[PDB]
Design a protein around this ligand. Structure first.
Ligand code: CLA
Ligand code: CLA
Ligand code: CLA
Ligand code: CLA
Ligand code: CLA
Ligand code: CLA
Ligand code: CLA
Ligand SMILES: CCCCCCCCCCCCCCCC(=O)OC[C@H](COP(=O)(O)OC[C@@H](O)CO)OC(=O)CCCCCCCCCCCCCCC
Ligand SMILES: CC1=C(/C=C/C(C)=C/C=C/C(C)=C\C=C\C=C(C)\C=C\C=C(C)\C=C\C2=C[C@@H](C)[C@H](O)CC2(C)C)C(C)(C)C[C@@H](O)C1
Ligand SMILES: CC1=C(/C=C/C(C)=C\C=C\C(C)=C/C=C/C=C(C)/C=C/C=C(C)/C=C/C2=C(C)C(=O)CCC2(C)C)C(C)(C)CCC1
Ligand SMILES: CC1=C(C/C=C(\C)CCC[C@H](C)CCC[C@H](C)CCCC(C)C)C(=O)c2ccccc2C1=O
Ligand code: SF4
Ligand code: SF4
Ligand SMILES: [Cl-]
Lengths: 141, 73, 69, 80, 73, 143, 40, 751
């Protein structure tokens, strides 16, 4: 969020990358360190080469960044788990996104507040007729 | 298949006896059931109703669509 | 009140096995909402499209099991 | 944005979060199950509604539920 | 009014055709039912209905149409 | 009396007679058409000359539906009963799905050969409580 | 061996054997007694 | 341990493993043994379907490339044995259930038949009277014409051929068993692509056509020379008599008096009486001159044998295909063909995609070349055989092409390694897939508007009483002037740019009207406005099919919508109702849609063929010289509107199909209705989804549990993918069977 660093992956270009949304609306960044210069698959099509050391790459969506991240941590002989994903606005604001609290979300970490939790079963949702003409749905109450 | 092979006589042609009997209950004498209105000796016909002659004349004439004759088709 | 080997009928309504019968595998300790583990001969619908079978075990609470045996 | 709810039948197997391709969900401490953990959905603004989480759920009918809602650029999965 | 004179041999008319795409063949083909301009033949059974009702002139139909204008208002 | 007046016996119907003098040979027997004509001349024909089957239940036309109905029902109840019986017998064999996919030929033949008594078997299972199950013991979906 | 008997008792082989037997039954019956629209 | 032969290698690159898989029957009784997700047994009915779905998916069974290769090799042997059984069955029915000799004695007054139907339940009527007291089903496969061109004259030769075919099937089956179980060749052996190409060029295709040139010269040509001269088939010597008595050849071909010396001294012209370049057709039979086809096979053999020497094997001479490929790179295409040799020598699916594409295209080329240059005696006059062969080869080609799309997609998902494709042709294709597909999309839109839209314009103009505003030969003309120009070039060629040819390569391009008996075999096929419009329909439908399948391959790994599609596989239903809905993104679903579009394309191609040949080519010719066509030249004025195709083609020509009851064609009406029913039936599977059916099954399972009759193998609704597969299979089956019954009734009822 200070200033993103890292070399761009060695890549000859493609038609599958950023469009107008990137400058008008929002784009996404993913950084990661690699112990070696090596080939990886671009989520936007084709092969690219990551540099030895730090790497910084811009993509159009959060999902493309997370797909690249899964590829990094599950498809290289020594894993790459230090990748960071940010949201970037045209104003220049950079919003750190992933991993949210410095710990991957699959494993418990202290300090997280439950969101969207219900203290009931799915079968214990109320009848819709009981909540009609309100703004809610049985899972929102 | 039975008509294709040149034996149209081997079809399963079920006569619609139920609806024909029903038509006969309203005066239709074509099928020869003679039930209720189709039977002059019946009490439903011996009522003196002002509509029975016209209804019978309209239903026993094969010139309208009133209770059209029916077959296996 | 349940023990391993008990035949129970499911009463959760929304569960795949409501009205069907399973067998108790283990009973978890107190403080847990759904401690009774039940196994079933008939798998449920669980699985991505085209998967061969499904899940045949689920956790319940005692009020949701009816002892048959 | 879509809605994602987590009910108390959660066994905390973490497959919810492992399946999410957009990091909507988290494992947070809890006490209802043996694993002492439950799934949470703090980032539903990035949810697209692919339903992978529920496809991963083992409990008899899901402990995680995704109800598709107001469509945005993010929820429609748009790269443009 | 014409179709009243001979309702078994005259084809009742729905409305007039006005289509600049037409050529000579279609103009001649749709100038039918005794009309001088292209026309469509009505199959809504509306002539028989209005005639059995008791209407016999274009004046009565026009008055009914204007009255329904007022009713809609 | 004058019932079924719309129809006439095929031996009376002249269109049937004309067409039956031309009944084709369905097999190798050069008399198959002639046997067909003789056989169908007993039913009731229509104005076109084809036989019409009366299935309102009168026994004079019992051969038009009642007898084949009885025959089919015996055979179909047989098939269903022996199949259900084999299906029940598999359940006590630890892995019933395999014998549903890989048939136990000796057991299945034993079950098939004993199907001629399926009406009495079904009556006994009805009285004994084996045939039908209770509602409260059958899985159902939310209402 | 037991494998060949098990393969010969699989659902597709068994159903095609039953179907072939029933086909033969019906074919031969209609060869020796054809054109039975009803029961005389 | 089974049979143990010596060894059988002679300083060869042959390498095998002895007895890797013992022969055994146990797994025959263990269905699903090959899939770990299936071996335990079923629990739901889905288990059954997948057992058939994955039976040949050798990749998904083992990760070992060598074992996959071995399975494929033995499967190929088994498939060849199946084809041998089928072909020997054809020859056996020709020997024992055909009127072949009777047809041979008089092929202008008898219809070929080679299937006799047993008399049962009235179906004996299908044994139509085909001439000479023979009663059976009229065949349209052209078997009689092939057998006459080959020089068959007797039932016993066909019977001997059927026995040889059965022995060949047994040999292929034993070879498959032997090379899977006894001596399984190593992966190193399969990857010898240079040697395999040398052998398939010089040995399979070269020696094949060489031996066939031998048979044509020694058996086909003298026997047909005598057959067309009016000699009765019984008076003609047996094939081996021309080889025992060379004077027979020498009097049929004086060059034989000189023997083989002119061959070895490059004095080939002496052979000009039996190695010919006549062109045109045989006036007696309407087919290509057998001498022309023998000279053709000789030259093709020389060509292929020469070709079989390009690649290096054990002797330093020859080419490395890897080197050639690596040398072809340019300023526009990065590293070029680097990596292609490794792809096509480690990926079975890549090879299969190439080979399916080319083999389908070839089958189509075969249909197109055989209709206009009829190679067999009396095939062109048999309009039913002509139509049937054209359409059959069309459909086979289309299916093979769609399969090529399927296996390009499977390669992309399963075998593509991005570390082995850095800045090569495949990589750059992936890197501008968007440009490729957006442009193909636009070309399809343009081609549809300016082909089908022209038909809609014409329909609307004709309905409006405005014939002068139509696209037609008599109004606003769309002349295909380039095709006309090339036809003229072909017609002038025998006298200029093909001097040593006497006639045209095909009379469709122009020239005389070759007629045998009273019917035309071939005549100039003129091209006008309706032909222009339908050719652009063809270009449009082909482009749309290509769009679908090419998009399927290029986006199988990822898209902007789904950037991890590769992890989802080649075959999968979607990725959920999210992202607006992602149904049918898989490569499999692109194949599923391309099937429908290929069916569309080919239906139009074959309808075009049928109508144009019936209207402007086929017909009967008077002794005065004039020609009268089957549908009286109606194509030019009627094929330019959709109403014209609906009325003058479909409606008019369907009269034979729908009136076939009461005759030997009745089965064609039966199967016409059958195809219609199957087409309608497919719409249930295509227009719905499995959730509804799973709930309906829930209710029915309740019914079964009520009487204690529910199965242990729980019924499940079909999967999403399987719903689509069933729907498309039934759609294609029903539509194709409909067109088949229609075509056969028509072409058999038109003289
Ligand atoms: C699905 C409804 C249906 C029904 C109602 C029928 C009915 C009939 N069809 Mg048809 N058919 C159908 C569909 C149907 N078909 C379809 C879809 C097709 C297209 C393929 C055909 C095409 C077709 C043809 C071409 C022909 C028929 C024929 C017949 C008749 C022959 C009956 C017979 O064989 O005698 C009775 C047969 C038996 C009794 C033998 C059955 C085997 C039993 C089980 C033997 C075992 C005996 C067992 C011990 C029971 C004995 C009694 C026991 C209690 C002691 C019959 C009325 C034939 C005919 O003659 O038409 C009039 C005929 O040629 N059908
Ligand atoms: C009686 C001789 C025999 C015996 C007992 C075996 C034994 C075995 N084979 Mg082998 N094999 C044989 C002949 C035989 N094979 C032949 C002739 C071929 C050449 C096609 C092969 C090629 C071969 C391959 C490539 C593979 C095996 C495999 C196997 C094992 C599993 C078989 C299975 O899945 O169930 C039995 C399955 C069937 C009987 C299939 C049903 C028949 C199909 C559906 C249609 C018939 C096609 C047929 C092959 C050719 C047509 C005959 C023609 C007259 C029309 C098994 C131990 C598999 C293996 O190793 O498992 C890991 C393996 O992948 N075999
Ligand atoms: C290759 C394709 C092919 C095709 C499609 C046909 C088609 C046909 N042939 Mg022909 N034939 C062929 C090849 C073929 N043949 C070959 C290669 C030969 C040389 C051996 C012959 C020799 C031949 C003769 C001599 C005759 C025919 C006849 C016929 C017709 C009658 C078919 C019939 O009633 O079968 C009969 C049906 C059976 C014998 C029962 C089949 C039993 C099945 C398989 C039961 C399946 C279940 C069982 C468990 C088997 C499973 C295997 C197990 C190991 C799991 C028919 C249209 C007849 C004909 O032309 O009529 C005038 C006739 O007489 N064929
Ligand atoms: C001149 C040598 C030669 C010939 C004739 C063939 C021919 C063939 N190969 Mg083979 N191949 C060869 C060398 C050869 N190969 C070598 C050296 C290698 C190692 C690199 C391979 C490795 C290879 C593989 C991996 C595969 C093939 C396959 C095939 C078959 C598929 C094409 C087809 O079906 O066509 C038409 C089919 C026919 C004409 C049927 C006839 C087949 C018989 C057995 C050939 C008999 C000819 C023989 C030389 C005797 C002639 C002498 C005399 C009678 C005149 C085909 C029959 C594929 C196959 O189908 O596997 C079985 C397969 O997958 N080849
Ligand atoms: C595979 C296909 C095939 C088969 C097996 C045959 C088989 C046969 N042919 Mg045939 N033929 C074929 C293709 C084939 N031919 C083709 C493509 C042509 C067109 C060119 C011909 C045209 C043809 C003619 C005109 C004749 C035959 C003849 C024969 C028969 C005797 C020839 C022989 O083999 O003696 C053995 C051959 C030799 C011993 C050759 C030695 C003679 C020369 C001098 C040796 C030179 C070889 C040397 C390496 C080259 C250097 C020469 C240079 C230094 C000057 C024989 C059964 C003859 C026959 O019997 O008629 C019925 C005959 O007259 N054929
Ligand atoms: C030499 C050609 C060739 C080769 C060997 C392969 C090989 C393979 N293909 Mg491919 N493909 C081909 C051509 C070929 N294909 C063609 C022509 C098409 C276009 C239709 C496709 C489209 C295609 C798709 C979409 C898929 C494959 C798949 C597969 C793999 C699994 C095979 C299978 O499905 O098992 C078993 C086969 C069956 C269960 C077929 C039964 C259903 C058929 C279609 C019924 C046909 C009806 C019959 C012809 C006429 C009606 C008769 C009826 C009335 C009784 C296998 C490795 C699958 C895969 O996952 O690849 C890894 C798959 O997804 N192929
Ligand atoms: C007759 C039915 C029909 C029609 C009209 C279409 C239409 C189209 N399909 Mg489609 N398709 C169909 C059936 C049909 N499909 C079915 C059953 C399937 C299931 C397999 C598919 C699956 C399918 C796929 C997978 C694809 C298509 C594609 C296309 C487009 C091809 C490009 C094109 O033709 O541009 C031009 C448009 C036309 C020729 C349509 C007719 C336009 C008329 C003649 C002029 C319009 C007059 C005017 C605008 C009227 C305005 C009125 C006013 C009041 C506003 C096209 C718009 C391909 C595509 O999108 O290519 C880019 C594509 O990939 N189809
Ligand atoms: C009826 C036909 C007459 C009408 C004329 C229509 C003109 C069509 C355009 C000309 C073809 C352009 C391709 C060659 C031009 C060509 O190959 O140049 C060569 C260039 C690559 O050359 P390299 O020097 O890199 O060669 C190295 C090789 O070894 C490969 O590594 O190709 C490209 O740049 C790729 C771009 C292709 C994208 C253009 C394709 C557009 C699709 C439409 C083409 C329609 C053709 C229909 C005919 C059947
Ligand atoms: C025993 C058996 C089973 C099950 C059997 C069960 C449980 C059956 C249950 C049946 C029920 C619950 C109800 C059945 C009702 C039947 C009715 C209402 C029949 C009505 C028929 C009429 C009115 C027929 C009339 C006509 C009479 C002949 C009266 C004329 O000419 C024609 C015609 C059509 C008028 C299985 C399934 C377990 C196994 C099978 O093999 C058989
Ligand atoms: C003071 C009064 C009385 C005197 C009443 C007098 C003096 C006149 C009464 C007239 C009345 C009471 C009703 C008249 C109704 C007419 C109606 C309602 C017309 C309805 C038409 C409709 C609805 C639409 C018709 C359509 C049109 C227009 C068409 O043209 C085509 C057909 C159709 C589409 C149907 C008496 C002393 C008796 C009783 C005491 C009160
Ligand atoms: C009807 C239907 C079903 C129900 C269809 C089912 C359950 C299949 C029933 C098949 C029966 C059990 C087999 C009958 C066909 C046999 C394969 C033929 C074998 C014949 C031999 C015995 C000779 C789906 O599951 C489905 C799923 C997705 C989209 C559409 C649909 C759909 O339309
Ligand atoms: S959402 Fe369900 S499957 Fe996922 S971790 Fe929670 S309880 Fe387990
Ligand atoms: S409708 Fe079916 S295929 Fe489409 S997204 Fe939903 S589940 Fe998937
Ligand atoms: Cl028209």
């Amino acid at each position: 969020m200070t200033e993103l660093s890292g070399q761009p992956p060695k890549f000859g270009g493609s038609t599958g990358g950023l469009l107008s949304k990137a400058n008008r609306e929002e784009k996404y960044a993913i950084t990661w360190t690699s112990a070696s210069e090596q080939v990886f698959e671009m989520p936007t099509g084709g092969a690219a080469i990551m540099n030895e050391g730090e790497n910084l790459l811009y993509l159009a969506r959060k999902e493309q960044c997370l797909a690249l991240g899964t590829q990094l941590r599950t498809k290289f002989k020594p894993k790459i788990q230090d990748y960071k994903i940010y949201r970037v606005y045209p104003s220049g604001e950079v919003q750190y996104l992933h991993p949210a609290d410095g710990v991957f979300p699959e494993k418990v970490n202290e300090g997280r507040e439950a969101q969207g939790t219900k203290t009931r079963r799915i079968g214990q949702n109320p009848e819709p007729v009981t909540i009609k003409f309100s703004g809610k749905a049985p899972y929102e109450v | 298949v039975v008509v294709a092979f040149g034996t149209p006589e081997k079809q399963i042609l079920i006569e619609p006896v139920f609806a024909q009997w029903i038509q006969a209950t309203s005066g239709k004498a074509l099928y020869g059931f003679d039930v209720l209105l189709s039977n002059p000796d019946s009490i439903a016909s011996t009522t003196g109703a002002a509509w029975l002659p016209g209804w019978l004349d309209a239903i026993n004439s094969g010139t309208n669509s009133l209770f059209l004759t029916i077959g296996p088709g | 009140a349940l023990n391993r080997g008990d035949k129970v009928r499911i009463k959760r309504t929304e569960s795949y096995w409501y009205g069907d019968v399973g067998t108790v595998a283990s009973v978890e300790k107190s403080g847990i909402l759904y401690p009774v583990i039940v196994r079933f001969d008939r798998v449920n619908y669980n699985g991505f499209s085209g998967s061969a079978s499904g899940v045949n075990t689920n956790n319940f609470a005692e009020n949701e099991l009816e002892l048959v045996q | 944005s879509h809605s994602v709810k987590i009910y108390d039948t959660c066994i905390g197997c973490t497959q919810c979060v492992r399946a999410c391709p957009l990091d909507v969900l988290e494992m947070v401490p809890w006490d209802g199950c043996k694993a002492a953990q439950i799934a949470s959905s703090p980032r539903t603004e990035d949810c697209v509604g692919c339903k992978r989480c529920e496809t991963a759920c083992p409990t008899d009918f899901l402990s995680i539920r995704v109800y598709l809602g107001a469509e945005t650029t993010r929820s429609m999965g748009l790269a443009y | 009014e014409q179709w009243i004179k001979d309702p078994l041999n005259i084809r009742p008319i729905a409305h007039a055709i006005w289509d600049p795409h037409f050529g000579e063949g279609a103009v001649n083909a749709f100038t039918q039912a005794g009309a001088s301009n292209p026309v469509n033949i009505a199959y809504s059974g509306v002539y028989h209905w209005f005639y059995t009702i008791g209407m016999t002139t274009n004046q009565e139909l026009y008055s009914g149409a204007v009255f329904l204008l007022v009713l809609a208002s | 009396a004058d019932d079924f007046a719309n129809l006439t016996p095929c031996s009376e119907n002249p269109a049937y007679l004309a067409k039956s003098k031309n009944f084709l040979n369905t097999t190798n027997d050069p008399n198959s058409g002639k046997i067909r004509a003789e056989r169908y001349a007993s039913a009731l024909c229509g104005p076109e000359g084809y036989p019409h089957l009366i299935v309102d239940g009168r026994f004079t036309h019992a051969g038009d539906f009642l007898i084949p109905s009885i025959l089919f029902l015996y055979i179909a109840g047989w098939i269903g009963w022996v199949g259900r019986s084999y299906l029940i017998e598999i359940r006590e064999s630890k892995n019933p799905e395999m014998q549903e996919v890989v048939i136990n030929v000796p057991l299945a033949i034993k079950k098939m050969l004993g199907g001629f008594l399926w009406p009495l078997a079904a009556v006994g299972e009805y009285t004994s409580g084996k045939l039908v199950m209770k509602d409260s013991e059958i899985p159902t979906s939310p209402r | 061996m037991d494998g060949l008997k098990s393969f010969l008792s699989t659902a597709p082989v068994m159903i095609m054997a039953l179907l072939t037997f029933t086909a033969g039954i019906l074919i031969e019956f209609n060869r020796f007694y054809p054109d039975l629209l009803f029961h005389p | 341990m089974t049979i143990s032969p010596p060894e059988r290698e002679a300083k060869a690159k042959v390498s095998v493993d002895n007895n890797p898989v013992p022969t055994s029957f146990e797994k025959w009784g263990k269905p699903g043994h090959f899939d770990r997700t299936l071996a335990r047994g079923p629990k739901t009915t889905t288990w059954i379907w997948n057992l058939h779905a994955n039976a040949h998916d050798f990749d998904s069974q083992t990760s070992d490339l060598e074992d996959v290769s071995r399975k494929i090799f033995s499967a190929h042997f088994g498939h060849l044995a199946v084809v041998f059984v089928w072909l020997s069955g054809m020859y056996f029915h020709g020997a024992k259930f055909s009127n072949y000799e009777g047809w041979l004695a008089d092929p202008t007054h008898i219809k070929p038949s080679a299937q006799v139907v047993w008399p049962i339940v009235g179906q004996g009527i299908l044994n139509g009277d085909v001439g000479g007291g023979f009663h059976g089903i009229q065949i349209t496969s052209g078997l009689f014409y092939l057998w006459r061109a080959s020089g068959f004259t007797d039932s016993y030769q066909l019977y001997c051929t059927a026995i040889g075919g059965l022995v060949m099937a047994a040999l292929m089956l034993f070879a498959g068993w032997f090379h899977y179980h006894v001596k399984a060749p190593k992966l190193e052996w399969f990857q010898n692509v240079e040697s395999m190409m040398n052998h398939h060029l010089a040995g399979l295709l070269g020696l094949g056509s060489l031996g066939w040139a031998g048979h044509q010269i020694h058996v086909s040509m003298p026997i047909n020379k005598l057959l067309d001269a009016g000699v009765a088939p019984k008076d003609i010597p047996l094939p081996h008599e021309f080889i025992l008595e060379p004077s027979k050849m020498a009097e049929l071909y004086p060059s034989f008096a000189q023997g083989l010396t002119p061959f070895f001294t490059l004095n080939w012209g002496v052979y000009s009486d039996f190695l010919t370049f006549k062109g045109g057709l045989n006036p007696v039979t309407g087919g290509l001159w057998l001498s022309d086809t023998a000279h053709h096979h000789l030259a093709i053999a020389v060509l292929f044998i020469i070709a079989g020497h390009m690649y290096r094997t054990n002797w330093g001479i020859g080419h490395s295909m890897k080197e050639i490929l690596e040398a072809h790179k340019g300023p526009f295409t990065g590293e070029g063909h680097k990596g292609l040799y490794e792809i096509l020598t480690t990926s079975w699916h890549a090879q299969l995609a190439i080979n399916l594409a080319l083999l389908g295209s070839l089958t189509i080329i075969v249909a197109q070349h055989m209709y206009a240059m009829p190679p067999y005696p009396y095939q062109a006059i048999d309009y039913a055989t002509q139509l049937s062969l054209f359409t059959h080869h069309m459909w086979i080609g289309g299916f093979l092409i769609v399969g090529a799309g399927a296996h390009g997609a499977i390669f992309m998902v399963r075998d593509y390694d991005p570390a082995k494709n850095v800045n090569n042709l495949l990589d750059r294709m992936l890197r501008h897939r968007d440009a490729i597909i957006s442009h193909l999309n636009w070309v399809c839109i343009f081609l549809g508007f300016h082909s089908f839209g022209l038909y809609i314009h014409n329909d609307t103009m004709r309905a409006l009483g405005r014939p002068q505003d139509m696209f037609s030969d008599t109004a606003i003309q769309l002349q295909p002037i380039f095709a006309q120009w090339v036809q003229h070039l072909h017609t002038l060629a025998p006298g200029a740019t093909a001097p040593n040819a006497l006639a045209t390569a095909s009379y469709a391009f122009g020239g005389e009207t070759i007629a045998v008996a009273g019917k035309v075999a071939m005549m100039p096929i003129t091209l006008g406005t309706a032909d222009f419009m339908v050719h652009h329909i063809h270009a449009f439908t082909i482009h749309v099919t290509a769009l679908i399948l090419l998009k399927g391959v290029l986006y199988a790994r990822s898209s902007r919508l789904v950037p991890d599609k590769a992890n989802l596989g080649f075959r999968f239903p979607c990725d959920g109702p999210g992202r607006g809905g992602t149904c049918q993104v898989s490569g499999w679903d692109h194949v599923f849609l391309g099937l429908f579009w290929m069916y569309n394309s080919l239906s139009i191609v074959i309808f075009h063929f049928s109508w144009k040949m019936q209207s402007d080519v086929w017909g009967t010719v008077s002794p005065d010289g004039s020609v009268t066509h089957v549908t009286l030249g109606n194509f030019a004025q009627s094929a330019i509107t959709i109403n014209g195709w609906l009325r003058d083609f479909l409606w008019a020509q369907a009269a034979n199909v729908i009136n076939s009851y009461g005759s030997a064609l009745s089965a064609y009406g039966i199967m016409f209705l059958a195809g219609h029913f199957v087409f309608a039936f497919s719409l249930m599977f295509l227009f719905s989804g499995r959730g509804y059916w799973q709930e309906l099954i829930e209710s029915i399972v309740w019914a079964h549990n009520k009487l204690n009759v529910a199965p242990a193998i729980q019924p499940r609704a079909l999967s999403i993918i399987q719903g689509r597969a069933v729907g498309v299979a039934h759609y294609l089956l029903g539509g194709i069977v409909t067109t088949w019954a229609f075509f056969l009734a028509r072409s058999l009822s038109i003289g």
